[PDB]
Amino acid sequence: CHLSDMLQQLHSVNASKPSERGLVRQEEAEDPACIPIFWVSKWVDYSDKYGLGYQLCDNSVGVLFNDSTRLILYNDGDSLQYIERDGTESYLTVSSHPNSLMKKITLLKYFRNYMSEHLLKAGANITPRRLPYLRTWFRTRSAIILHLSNGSVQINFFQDHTKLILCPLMAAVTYIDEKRDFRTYRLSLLEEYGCCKELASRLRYARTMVDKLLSSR
Amino acid sequence: PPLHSTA
């Protein structure tokens, strides 16, 4: 299980106190091989009425609706994946779908418009890399926590625009800092080589966030 | 309290 592996990876790095290093050698912990294929580039919280809309870095759009269904529009602009409450995955198109799915598709297009016109694409400088959906999300005062169906957990921090993408299959983390510089690390190498105070702080917070996901299944 | 990602 991805989240459990992630909790272990984060305990291990954090128990090592990586910032309390005489000689921090954070560069030697980079692993460009573990760069994620997918992360969330943009999002819009319309959850008080409809759901949470988001764009992945491949330009695909998705919505986790309030009724616990999910609609994914692929980056071709017409292919859909729909996920009913019982988890049934199906392939459809905007051009050919059930009539009952019109309100949802209309909503997705509205959200996609807002996101396309007004929001910045996180990680737009990065060349990445099956298509994950948003399993669950929540917000704190500090951050939004997005858990994708491929096991990845992304945590975006509001105040300083820093972000973590935690990749349990690679035991890795990608950190996008205040400068929009994107660096991908193997967590066990952060244990050996150490890291800056700011990243160690975000990793401590990340473990609390994975605790919250594991405790709210 | 942002209701969307970075503009």
Author numbering:
A (entry chain A): 372 to 500, 507 to 594
B (entry chain B): 73 to 79
Please, what does the article write about this entry?
We examined the crystal-packing interactions formed by the polo-box domain (PBD) of polo-like kinase 1 (Plk1), a validated anti-cancer target, whose phosphorylation-dependent protein–protein interactions are crucial for successful progression of the cell through mitosis. We have observed an unreported binding site in a number of crystal structures of the PBD, which is formed by the rearrangement of surface residues involved in crystal packing. This site is located close to the phosphopeptide-binding groove, making it potentially accessible for phosphorylated proteins binding to the PBD. The new binding site consists of seven residues: Val415, Leu478, and Phe482 form the bottom of the pocket whilst Tyr417, Tyr421, Tyr481, and Tyr485 form the sides of the pocket.
We further investigated the influence of Phe71PBIP1 on its interaction with the PBD. The thermal shifts of 9.7 °C observed for 72-DPPLHSpTA-79 (lacking Phe71), and 10.5 °C observed for 71-ADPPLHSpTA-79 were significantly lower than the one observed for 71-FDPPLHSpTA-79 and showed no significant difference between the wild-type and mutant protein. When DPPLHSpTA is bound to the protein, the hydrophobic pocket adopts a closed conformation and does not participate in peptide binding.
